[PDB]
């Protein structure tokens, strides 16, 4: 989560 959620740096 937050960091890398599976894209990039988002969310959080």
Request: net charge positive.
């Amino acid at each position: 989560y937050c960091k890398f959620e599976x894209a990039t740096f988002k969310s959080c």
